[model samples]
Target chain A: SGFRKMAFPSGKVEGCMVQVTCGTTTLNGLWLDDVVYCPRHVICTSEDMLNPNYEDLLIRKSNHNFLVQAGNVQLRVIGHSMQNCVLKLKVDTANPKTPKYKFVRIQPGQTFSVLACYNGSPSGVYQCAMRPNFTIKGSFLNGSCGSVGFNIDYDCVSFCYMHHMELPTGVHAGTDLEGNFYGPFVDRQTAQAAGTDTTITVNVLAWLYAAVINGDRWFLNRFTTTLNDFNLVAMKYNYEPLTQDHVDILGPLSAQTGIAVLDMCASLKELLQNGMNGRTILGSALLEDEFTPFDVVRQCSGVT
Target chain B: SGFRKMAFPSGKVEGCMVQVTCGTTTLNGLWLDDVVYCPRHVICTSEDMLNPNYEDLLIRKSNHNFLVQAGNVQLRVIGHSMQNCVLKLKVDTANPKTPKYKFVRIQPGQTFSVLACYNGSPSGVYQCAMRPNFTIKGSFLNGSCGSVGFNIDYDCVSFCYMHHMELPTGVHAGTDLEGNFYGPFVDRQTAQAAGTDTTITVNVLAWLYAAVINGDRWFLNRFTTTLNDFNLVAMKYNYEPLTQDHVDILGPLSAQTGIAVLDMCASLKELLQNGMNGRTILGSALLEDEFTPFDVVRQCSGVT
Candidate 1:
């Protein structure tokens, strides 16, 4: 926990010839080094400005999907489209549920920067771009500019979930699970409606794929519970029942990377033993569809 | 949505008796009131500062559990124990899902004031004790003090749900729904071990009891969905199935209050028509229990 100190200015130098203007009155001494001799003789620095890097219109991916460096703060833009975005900036600590944010205007080619702080310290992380509409237009820039930390990381699962679930992503956002539909913003509607994407089961699969690739046990454990919550009935509400076809689309990267997809199956089994319930609901639904418990397991495992 | 302003202090007064310290050096000053002789020497009052009142430690009830006004800000303490409390205070607007809060120490018999602002404004809410462990030492006092808000409202259903479901409610907080137990915290172990309390069914009943007495449709509608989620099998996991004995505990309050318990039954049916699940789950559980669907309805309605 750190505290920010303001400019405590001392008296101006006698020989400094830079004339500083305050409101209508002009003074003939340089207000050097932001040292305020008095309130009227205040000087501001370049660091005390909210400047957006409009010249560099670019968005690139970072290693971490959850956190994008903006200024010195880590911003997690969980869900967003061209018109709307859901941003969660870690002002102090990275508590997933309770993070501070701002509903700012996200222009297509403009990467914005604001003087932000993390834990009362000057760690500002500025937001850049993502998606076709608001991607980095220039050479990939992934470093700090002045005091502002600028970078962008796209969350594929979050994007997929938002794509399938709803558009606005906040307040009156709709969920696809319940068949609640509000057409995404005009720019995103074509992309949203081009394909009949049925199940978020594949979205979970894709996320697990990333987690497996990154070897993130935290994401694996947390997302496993989320997947377990997806009942067969709920998953198949808008889309048809999941099949091997969908699994094949994710491809056999687990095989290529030595990350066994079967590990997810094993982890799920452990979760079931530890009292996961939605699988039973899904299994029951499968049974109603004339598939046995073994069939349900095989289907979930993407086995023929 | 708002921004805060800072005091712009002028020069020190001539030969002022008070010695003022700025950083390291001490200067004689009547510069206390930020007197500027130029544009306007404005002396800001106490009304400009955000302050809170103490001395009150009383708990009342609120209609909505999400937003509770103890002071100016609405605080929602999502999870709590006698030892640990997790509070989310919205020092601004009351967006149920999103609110800011602090993790302050809740000392027994010590009421504290925080200089919290409501949306960059000077509306501050003071904190006080609510539980038996944290209540006021003397006679309970509940009232507002100055512009600073001060009071505490206890949410019984939230307490009951958190108490029965799991102590420290969070993402990975294990529940007893599928017979998964990690043992409640030390304080709640005795109550947790004593007789089964299946079904937040009873919790909803208690909530409805209050709602019935007051005749509030909003509470009735909101809570009915919660009760609908309580399937008999899930409810009967740790405890026995719903019986006349259980109904007697909630008692014939519907009759006494002249608020028909049958109204809840009607609400459930309405919910079913409007696409509420779990009745089928409850009915299936009843059939497994050697009871008919008719018996399920009768038992839920507390009718013979």
Candidate 2:
């Protein structure tokens, strides 16, 4: 019994198959750590996700801020999670082979931004990109040009998922506290039969672009004040829900391949590459997450 | 002289500028007040530069990291020595209709880097971009690619007609002690003898790129130690300077245009935009600062 227990200070390698566990999982975004216990039970160090990569750009003489009307501005990725997670950023500029794109890491739940400087003085082609890591699940999305009812452009009546504590707030037909059920106008059973995608728009898109953009008090107050009624259901405008269009235009390649967003983005790139002005589709239907998946590149480029 | 000076909080704003200023001259990058400055007016700033105008990009996503690559970044000014000019980085994810690209002023000489996050993770882009305005004069009319040999690279190379130092020992000709001056080599007399489109090769290009990319010590060392003798200069590589072929594609619409080296990131964007695989005669040769006059979008893409 004299040899009570073991400690880490002694660097002898042991526990080759030690199973490292996460006490509590974060909401959505993945968790990253500088050091991790590999499957072999060895702890290793990783580059921090917060490092920023730099570049030199020129200042264009023709226009003080030629970037003012640049064709392709910032390319950004954004995510949110209800919980916190560590992050890291990296860039592989010296690959010397295939094209190497720059990378950046942001703090968990915090937003990070990067700037693009042109090659010369005066003003050069530039762009600003900002993103937040770890997005909240079942959150609202915005009604962008491609979203439903976007074309007419009356500032677009935005919408978001409005969950009810009771069955459809006893006002509408069907919808439960967890958003597990739905309702019909005359009959709750009927609404439940149809399900939520038909009964409730979720309005997640509206929430993401409009509420988030407006920085509205009502939205923030609801999340911060109630803190308890945070529903776990995806929300969107009454008109739209996450669908193939979303996947085809905004999800990952795997998801986009399934949803066809790549075809859409390719079309855009084609138009632009051909010396044609890119088109912005106005008012498309909502995409249902269940129908398609998420593609980060498509989400950023509006392509599948 | 005892008048109470308005404490502008070292790095706070005075006008369109923000961040902090360090170093002695225009060759510095903008920095945040908390950062330290380098010697010889090497203005290292804490602020990061990563912004482009609104039309420059598609909408920025909220929580995902956007990946991008840029080549041939620029920083230029008119006849006036653009020493104190401030660089601004702006972010605009607010309204897709009228995205806001607000400027966050940075000091002179401070390098800015890019950081991106994905799925709630983050990483950096490229390496860091260093700054310090340069004083480059001459023209590129000949129609070929040329190399300017230099003993070293100096982002902050400067020349003072009154204070110009005598050529140092071993210091390469064409390339001055500071490693300034590049191809299209023409003494004042030769330059006056020729007109637009003359092909000349200066020794500065090789020296600067060597120091900047290869991190050669010869140029970084004291002038007396690394100076290239006239014999060395004569033995150095010679070529007809870059001519009209380099920049003629800009067309009559060209006065002078600038862009971010990072934005023009040739490989990926080119592959994405044009069907051609990313290959070239110069490879990264066009990356030199002296090649600034070349119209990249035209020269690289071979399209209008």
Candidate 3:
């Protein structure tokens, strides 16, 4: 919560950078300097706030967009810049291990891709960056990687962190609406291990909070669309009848503080971890009586 | 190491599983039972060890393969089955919390794709599975979703765990071969934050032992290739020049026991964590004179 307080404040634009400065000078990406009277300012600014030279550099560099594609277990980078660009591929396999990276040069307006054959499973996310026509010893500050700059002590990278989702197999079948019959429903353990519970909770909460704070229709629409898929899946098995009533529940309450929503999220996580068994996931005081297994399906199915 | 020792032994195939059982009952994936005197046998088997009916089920189901593709942040599942196949996409995003999934019923031989539109940053990986021709109460065993049959507490599913990778952006620049810095070289802090120092150390050691033990050509080749990248990076910066001589050093020792090699790995990890700055990384008695930054690059860069 303290980190979040420092990271996010009321009326702060989402995705904006929080600047922690020492003295009158800002230390956005520079190595920390020792100042006698240092003051850390948690100033909220736009994504490009630290990059004073970004616009100049953008104009100086060839006006081109970099494109990335997924190859067979590898990644392909297409540099559309008229000038040559250097590419760095940062890989996170999501295991409790250190991530690895690959660096290469792309000729002017050329494309290159890394091979998929890793010694280990390339099973997580990859972050790619393209810097055009870099010169030696030049000031190359202020670019987004992972909410930080490249040279900074903090994890630096870009905003382009793409997630990879692998489908589960060999999952056990599930009981039909009535506990007596088996169907295509995924079991509790299978669902949990496959990350069914966490995905739904985060995305559902993301959808709710995004809708509440910014009325971000795009995120809301995307989240709801995913939710619909689960609702339909729950409906197919007759877990409970599906409905759109939760949207009403979410809409008006979107204006309330995030605490209530955060509390609701914990409950949502519990329900999802319980395999979204609406009939059996006994409702807490927070959950309305109208909530059912179908709502659980509607809520969690589209997560991830 | 103890867990791995208990898991893998001589005569263990690459994809083997370790089996534990009770009297007259195998507990490959079943939740524990309070049977008296439950004995555990760490028997090693293949990746498909538990699924005896897999081959039969595979032959019975559509003989064709299942393919997954990424389309604009959405996943496309192509199920090739003779009968109507109901495909369930079980997605694991690998976030610290629980995961979410999406299930769909794909017509036989039909390709179904969803529209998730993750913000240009789909850097995380998703694992998916396909349950072919699942029926109510029908014999639906041996699928590729997870390990177990899917509901009894153990994370059961079939063997189909597909991995996807995405690229990041705005990385820092690095020194080129000519001492001219190029754009987008991942910094040490960024790399370390992506994972800890311990992760690379473990994996690098794992790769070394694996290469030393099996002498697997593909793994060796792939490993060496990555090492070259780092060597080239270091060489360009005048850090050191790398070579494949270590392989020869390791080859003859392959016939001997692993104690020396294991001892060598710890020293190697220390050198790697110190940014491969050969001059700074004080040598242990175990490291040879030939061990330098070049060797560090050669050894660590090739690591996954």
Model 3 reproduces what portion of true contacts? 0.01
Best by TM-score: 1
lDDT for predicted candidate 2 compared with the true structure: 0.18
Those runs of model 1 whose alpha carbons end farther than 4 Å from true positions after fitting are A1-197, A206-237, A240-259, A262-304, B1-197, B202-261, B265-304
How would you order the candidates by DockQ, starting with the best? 1, 3, 2
lDDT score, candidate 1: 0.24
i-RMSD of model 3 (Å, 1 decimal):
22.0
lDDT of each model, Cα atoms only?
0.24, 0.18, 0.22
Q: What lDDT tens digits, residue by residue, belong to model 1 across residues B103-163? A: 2233222222211122112211112121212211111011100111111111110110011
lDDT per residue, candidate 2, A262-288, as tens digits?
333233223223422221111111121
* Share of native C-alpha contacts between chains A and B (below 8 angstroms) recovered by candidate 1: 0.00
Q: What TM-score does chain B get in every candidate?
A: 0.23, 0.16, 0.19
**Which digits, one per residue and each the tens of the lDDT, describe model 3 over residues B176-221?**
1111212222212223111111112222333344333323222122
Q: State which candidate, 2 or 3, has the greater TM-score.
A: 3
lDDT of 1 at B234: 36
Please provide, for model 2 over B43-124, each residue's C-alpha lDDT reduced to its tens digit, 9 standing for 90 to 100. Answer: 2221211222222221322111211111112212111111111122222211122211222222211122221112111111
* TM-score, predicted candidate 2 vs. hidden true structure: 0.17
What is the DockQ of the complex in model 2? 0.01
